[PDB]
C-alpha cells in the first residue's frame, strides 16, 4: 500500500520546497530514504496551522 505519490504536483512541490530549504543553508539528519511518518508530521502541523 502507498499513501504518498512523491511526483504528484502538490506533493512534488512540497518536496522541491524542502529540498531547496535544505540546499540554501543546512538542516538536520539526512535524507533520500523517506518515511511516511514524516509526511504525517508535516501534514499534522499543517492541520494545526490551519486550525
Amino acid at each position, epitope marked *: 500500500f502507498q499513501l504518498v505519490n512523491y511526483t504528484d504536483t502538490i506533493p512534488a512541490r512540497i518536496m*522541491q520546497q524542502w*529540498r*531547496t530549504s*535544505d*540546499s*540554501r*543553508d*543546512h*538542516t*538536520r539528519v*539526512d*535524507w*533520500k530514504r523517506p518515511k511516511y511518518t514524516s509526511a504525517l508530521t508535516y501534514d499534522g502541523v499543517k492541520v494545526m496551522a490551519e486550525a
Partner: single-chain antibody
Amino acid sequence: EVKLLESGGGLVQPGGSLKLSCAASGFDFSEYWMSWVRQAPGKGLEWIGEINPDSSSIDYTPSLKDKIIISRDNAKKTLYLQLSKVRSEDTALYYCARPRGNYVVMDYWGQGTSVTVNIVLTQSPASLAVSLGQRATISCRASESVDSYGSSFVHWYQQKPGQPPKLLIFLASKLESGVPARFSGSGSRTDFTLTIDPVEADDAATYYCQQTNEDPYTFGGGTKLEIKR
C-alpha cells in the same frame, strides 16, 4: 559510486565566451541540486552559484551576476556554466559539486577545470610536518557562534595541488562515505579540531574548515600537511 567529471577548461581569450560542462554518473541528477564554486590560485574558494534539478531557481553571488550563467540537463545529467567577457580574475579553478548544503552525507565535489585568460575562521597551525603512521591535530577557531540546533554545521575538506577538495568530514562528528576511518572530528561551539590517525603519505595536502551556518558562507585559511621522511 558518485562520479563527476568536468570538461571544457583550458585557455580562453579575454572578452570572449566560455562553456564548461560537468557530467555526472552513479546518481540521479534530476532530483539532486548542483553547485559551482571558483577558487583562485593560492587563495581561498569562492562559491559561484547553485542550481536546482528542475531549472526553476538558479542562485548566484550578488557581485558576479552579469558574467555567469548556470544551466543543467537532467536527460544527459550534465551541468553547464557559461561565462561571457572574461577578465584577468577569471584565471581560476572552477569546480562543480553535488548538494553540499542540502545533504551532508551525499556531499561530493567534482574535479573542476582550470580557466586561464561576521564569522572569521582561523586555522591552526599554518604549516606542520608529521611522520607516517602518526596522529596529527588541526584546530579551527570561529569568531561567531556556528552552533545551530545542537549540530555544528562545519565541513572539513582536503585539497591538493591539482586535486579538488574532497569532503572529508561533515557536521564535525561524521565521516564521509568512501574515505577510510583515518580522520575524526570534535570540538565545541568556538573551537573545532580534526584529528588524523594514522598518517599516510597520500594525505599531504591543504586542509580547510568551512562553515555555512549563516551569511556569508566563509572558507578556511588553508593548512598544508607535510609528510616527514
